[PDB]
RNA sequence: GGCGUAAAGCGCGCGUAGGCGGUUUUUUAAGUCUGAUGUGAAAGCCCACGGCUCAACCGUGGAGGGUCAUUGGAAACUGGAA
RNA sequence: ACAUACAGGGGGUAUUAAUUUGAAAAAGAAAA
């Protein structure tokens, strides 16, 4: 939502490429939309969707329009701090934390977000609907709405050694 | 700072459809309108007098965005009093986020003047020259008054922000702070960098935009 | 239909490709110009000549050859032009003289890149890659606009399409715009792919 | 038993599977070998890491799945523990002591009978040695030119294996921690493969 | 998981059974929590160890398994009484 | 009080008709 952001060498990843039509008098003008996430594997994933007349200009436009949408993703040793259910567009994603050494058990779009978010150790399940822009928006609506330990224990006044980790 | 007794006709509203996030800033209700509380007006003015000063010492500009009638001449006369840039007439849809294609039209006010010394007067035919004069008059009209906008401005100043919805929409989506004279139906309550005052006269715009014109002046002189 | 710009701009701003006079006989000059252009069409397979221009003054022809690769019409130091000129003296039974000039900015004229794109599409490359790299290597020299339409069985396709990657000004109706045009055929295994390069350079 | 090429099933997966000379032709086997072969999917990446771990040690995939199910019983991280269970096999240790030149010679070496653990004759390549066992070399058949050829080359015996070369009798000392197993296989796409 | 338009709100009352029920105080102990004892056979799942040259298999030991019963406590909530 | 648009039902406007069975404009990139 904010400014262009080029901190680390990011890693692109194509979630989908769809060929979308527009009916005119004559044939039809069809374009390539290309939902592409980026993310630099220490936190900071972020998606983006761009469309163009041809395919590598569409994924290049989606990379250059994806870097303004970078969420923070607070995490603990390659794992999410708690279980969530991220909701957008009836496309929700269950994200349960995990031990080390279990893989990104996630589906198609949510694995492509999560495995280059830095998170290597998670248990997902894609509830709801299997549309890729809704599942990608629901797993980043999951990951941005996520509580760290020090951020909650500086939000309320009970800091370290007050609650239980 | 400022003063409550300096505010002659510098308080009031255009009450008919006020926003109730501006329930904390009213004084009372006098003569139809909601008049606005001036203990907290002068306090947010001196908080903005700190804020426009302290952030602008490393290449720091303000953008004076006042597009409203009886609010455009205040910015038009007071921006180059301050030495900064402004937009008095027709804020563009897309001037902050859309800088990669209005860099072509921040340069083409200078391009025309790179043709006046080395051949413009009727070396072309007659249907190019007066059209390029109309392009110069429109690009000094609809652009604003900016010329030396090298980067995105790190501060911004909107004057009548209930009408300038896309002026706040590009400053919110570039995380640069706003200063707005919040009238009635301004949705900022979440940001504490607004001015709770009145924009209904020339003087009521003028005396609270002149202090933020001279506010940055005191940011140049002493630490650069 | 879209007319070609070299039809529209001979005798407006760009000169003809033959400068002589003939009134009485008139078929013994143009057809010998056609066979000498067909004989320079044999060395177009290596030499990459854009166009030759016939200057028949009174008896001998100062034919002006314009190749983008100028060092392979002449050979090592001038042998290949002389054995070529003796072959033209055999094949038109008249006198000729080869006038060569060395034309650089090779990606700004239409016939050199039209034979180059038809050469790349003979060698089963994908058409979008050579089309985008031809128009971006013609813009990184500096051009004012390049239309490049390849057409036909596109990359070994079953149905013919018309892949045009226009970029910038190709203003065919402003008549003081010297627009180079060439259509070059590409004999691929899946048929005949016509390129069409339309470069406006001011 | 694989019994096939082990060169042609090592240009497909990409890693060497013998140790160096895989080299002059690194692309792909088959008629569509050098023809600029395309991207791999998520299942293609997970299956290429699974056959990079299967065809190295040489097993069939029922033994690979039943080595994966008894690697999930143990207390650690799972893809690492699977590789400390796979290279604790008697094939990979009798290769990894340098008793054979390659792993298929170590499977022919252990299966025909020519090693012993602890003085007992084990003729299987799916024994998993516990840490602390000694591996003998069957005294009748320790004057074979296979074994005294490949012990004479020093083959970088690792830090979890002590080899006593003049007696030809090595011990399997440690469980190997995850640096000194084969380093050309991501273990994370094995455990991601067997949740698919 | 839903019920405006996708399948889905009885056409709408009066009401019996049933389900749920505002605040405080005292008390009980059926729900509830916590503990002991009996019991939930052996084989099986799981964990660990040993025997088959490893494994399958086999054996040993522990864990787990009930809306179980008897019985000792606690009283915040639901239930009973005032 | 003054302007130009959109909201819904009060009650408006029926010129005077008939349509044709079956396949071929499919559709795609990761890099140089």
Tab-separated table of N, CA and C in Angstrom, chain B residues 126-177:
chain	number	residue	atom	x	y	z
B	126	UNK	N	2.451	27.779	-38.414
B	126	UNK	CA	1.710	28.604	-37.460
B	126	UNK	C	0.792	27.783	-36.565
B	127	UNK	N	0.439	26.567	-36.984
B	127	UNK	CA	-0.405	25.669	-36.211
B	127	UNK	C	0.395	24.720	-35.315
B	128	UNK	N	1.565	25.149	-34.840
B	128	UNK	CA	2.341	24.425	-33.840
B	128	UNK	C	2.694	25.370	-32.699
B	129	UNK	N	2.917	26.642	-33.040
B	129	UNK	CA	3.443	27.622	-32.094
B	129	UNK	C	2.403	28.080	-31.076
B	130	UNK	N	1.196	28.443	-31.520
B	130	UNK	CA	0.163	28.902	-30.593
B	130	UNK	C	-0.454	27.733	-29.830
B	131	UNK	N	-0.434	26.531	-30.420
B	131	UNK	CA	-0.784	25.312	-29.700
B	131	UNK	C	0.231	24.960	-28.624
B	132	UNK	N	1.514	25.232	-28.872
B	132	UNK	CA	2.533	24.987	-27.861
B	132	UNK	C	2.498	26.065	-26.779
B	133	UNK	N	2.026	27.271	-27.136
B	133	UNK	CA	1.728	28.311	-26.146
B	133	UNK	C	0.553	27.935	-25.250
B	134	UNK	N	-0.487	27.317	-25.824
B	134	UNK	CA	-1.601	26.818	-25.021
B	134	UNK	C	-1.187	25.639	-24.148
B	135	UNK	N	-0.230	24.825	-24.616
B	135	UNK	CA	0.319	23.754	-23.784
B	135	UNK	C	1.164	24.303	-22.641
B	136	UNK	N	1.860	25.427	-22.869
B	136	UNK	CA	2.598	26.082	-21.785
B	136	UNK	C	1.675	26.724	-20.757
B	137	UNK	N	0.576	27.340	-21.210
B	137	UNK	CA	-0.377	27.976	-20.302
B	137	UNK	C	-1.167	26.935	-19.504
B	138	UNK	N	-1.446	25.778	-20.105
B	138	UNK	CA	-2.100	24.717	-19.357
B	138	UNK	C	-1.142	23.991	-18.420
B	139	UNK	N	0.146	23.870	-18.775
B	139	UNK	CA	1.095	23.205	-17.887
B	139	UNK	C	1.729	24.137	-16.863
B	140	UNK	N	1.461	25.440	-16.924
B	140	UNK	CA	1.593	26.289	-15.741
B	140	UNK	C	0.271	26.489	-15.025
B	141	UNK	N	-0.851	26.089	-15.627
B	141	UNK	CA	-2.151	26.169	-14.974
B	141	UNK	C	-2.495	24.894	-14.211
B	142	UNK	N	-2.561	23.757	-14.906
B	142	UNK	CA	-3.073	22.540	-14.291
B	142	UNK	C	-2.027	21.761	-13.532
B	143	UNK	N	-0.760	22.138	-13.624
B	143	UNK	CA	0.254	21.410	-12.875
B	143	UNK	C	0.250	21.835	-11.417
B	144	UNK	N	0.086	23.128	-11.176
B	144	UNK	CA	0.145	23.692	-9.848
B	144	UNK	C	1.017	24.922	-9.857
B	145	UNK	N	2.090	24.884	-9.085
B	145	UNK	CA	3.109	25.904	-9.176
B	145	UNK	C	4.482	25.327	-8.953
B	146	UNK	N	4.560	24.005	-8.900
B	146	UNK	CA	5.808	23.296	-8.667
B	146	UNK	C	6.670	23.397	-9.917
B	147	UNK	N	7.979	23.544	-9.720
B	147	UNK	CA	8.941	23.318	-10.797
B	147	UNK	C	10.108	22.429	-10.402
B	148	UNK	N	10.633	22.548	-9.186
B	148	UNK	CA	11.846	21.862	-8.766
B	148	UNK	C	11.517	20.665	-7.881
B	149	UNK	N	10.474	19.925	-8.229
B	149	UNK	CA	10.114	18.737	-7.469
B	149	UNK	C	11.045	17.620	-7.921
B	150	UNK	N	12.172	17.478	-7.223
B	150	UNK	CA	13.151	16.461	-7.583
B	150	UNK	C	12.742	15.078	-7.107
B	151	UNK	N	12.160	14.984	-5.916
B	151	UNK	CA	11.804	13.705	-5.322
B	151	UNK	C	10.361	13.777	-4.846
B	152	UNK	N	9.937	12.749	-4.133
B	152	UNK	CA	8.693	12.838	-3.389
B	152	UNK	C	8.887	13.753	-2.182
B	153	UNK	N	7.949	14.660	-1.903
B	153	UNK	CA	8.089	15.526	-0.730
B	153	UNK	C	7.840	14.772	0.564
B	154	UNK	N	8.743	14.989	1.516
B	154	UNK	CA	8.691	14.329	2.813
B	154	UNK	C	7.657	14.935	3.752
B	155	UNK	N	7.146	16.121	3.447
B	155	UNK	CA	6.017	16.673	4.171
B	155	UNK	C	4.964	17.064	3.148
B	156	UNK	N	3.733	17.253	3.622
B	156	UNK	CA	2.641	17.692	2.767
B	156	UNK	C	1.653	18.495	3.602
B	157	UNK	N	0.987	19.443	2.943
B	157	UNK	CA	0.063	20.395	3.559
B	157	UNK	C	-1.139	20.501	2.626
B	158	UNK	N	-2.272	19.946	3.039
B	158	UNK	CA	-3.521	20.134	2.321
B	158	UNK	C	-4.308	21.198	3.082
B	159	UNK	N	-5.043	22.024	2.345
B	159	UNK	CA	-5.764	23.140	2.924
B	159	UNK	C	-7.239	22.817	3.138
B	160	UNK	N	-7.970	22.488	2.076
B	160	UNK	CA	-9.374	22.120	2.208
B	160	UNK	C	-9.515	20.643	1.854
B	161	UNK	N	-9.405	19.728	2.816
B	161	UNK	CA	-9.214	18.306	2.503
B	161	UNK	C	-10.486	17.480	2.360
B	162	UNK	N	-11.672	18.054	2.539
B	162	UNK	CA	-12.905	17.332	2.278
B	162	UNK	C	-13.218	17.252	0.797
B	163	UNK	N	-12.666	18.158	0.011
B	163	UNK	CA	-12.801	18.168	-1.429
B	163	UNK	C	-11.598	17.526	-2.101
B	164	UNK	N	-10.411	17.696	-1.527
B	164	UNK	CA	-9.180	17.090	-2.025
B	164	UNK	C	-9.002	15.678	-1.501
B	165	UNK	N	-9.856	14.751	-1.938
B	165	UNK	CA	-9.811	13.385	-1.432
B	165	UNK	C	-8.635	12.613	-2.007
B	166	UNK	N	-8.266	12.888	-3.254
B	166	UNK	CA	-7.118	12.215	-3.838
B	166	UNK	C	-5.791	12.818	-3.406
B	167	UNK	N	-5.799	13.990	-2.769
B	167	UNK	CA	-4.570	14.531	-2.203
B	167	UNK	C	-4.153	13.785	-0.948
B	168	UNK	N	-5.118	13.431	-0.096
B	168	UNK	CA	-4.843	12.597	1.063
B	168	UNK	C	-4.648	11.142	0.670
B	169	UNK	N	-5.236	10.701	-0.443
B	169	UNK	CA	-5.132	9.313	-0.880
B	169	UNK	C	-3.766	8.956	-1.444
B	170	UNK	N	-3.011	9.932	-1.928
B	170	UNK	CA	-1.655	9.654	-2.362
B	170	UNK	C	-0.646	9.880	-1.256
B	171	UNK	N	-0.959	10.748	-0.303
B	171	UNK	CA	-0.084	10.898	0.845
B	171	UNK	C	-0.247	9.776	1.855
B	172	UNK	N	-1.440	9.179	1.958
B	172	UNK	CA	-1.594	8.012	2.817
B	172	UNK	C	-0.948	6.792	2.186
B	173	UNK	N	-0.947	6.716	0.865
B	173	UNK	CA	-0.375	5.561	0.201
B	173	UNK	C	1.064	5.765	-0.232
B	174	UNK	N	1.759	6.748	0.328
B	174	UNK	CA	3.205	6.842	0.209
B	174	UNK	C	3.903	6.976	1.558
B	175	UNK	N	3.169	6.714	2.667
B	175	UNK	CA	3.465	7.008	4.097
B	175	UNK	C	4.227	8.315	4.339
B	176	UNK	N	3.730	9.401	3.761
B	176	UNK	CA	4.220	10.735	4.085
B	176	UNK	C	3.120	11.416	4.898
B	177	UNK	N	3.443	12.227	5.904
B	177	UNK	CA	2.393	12.754	6.780
B	177	UNK	C	1.632	13.915	6.162
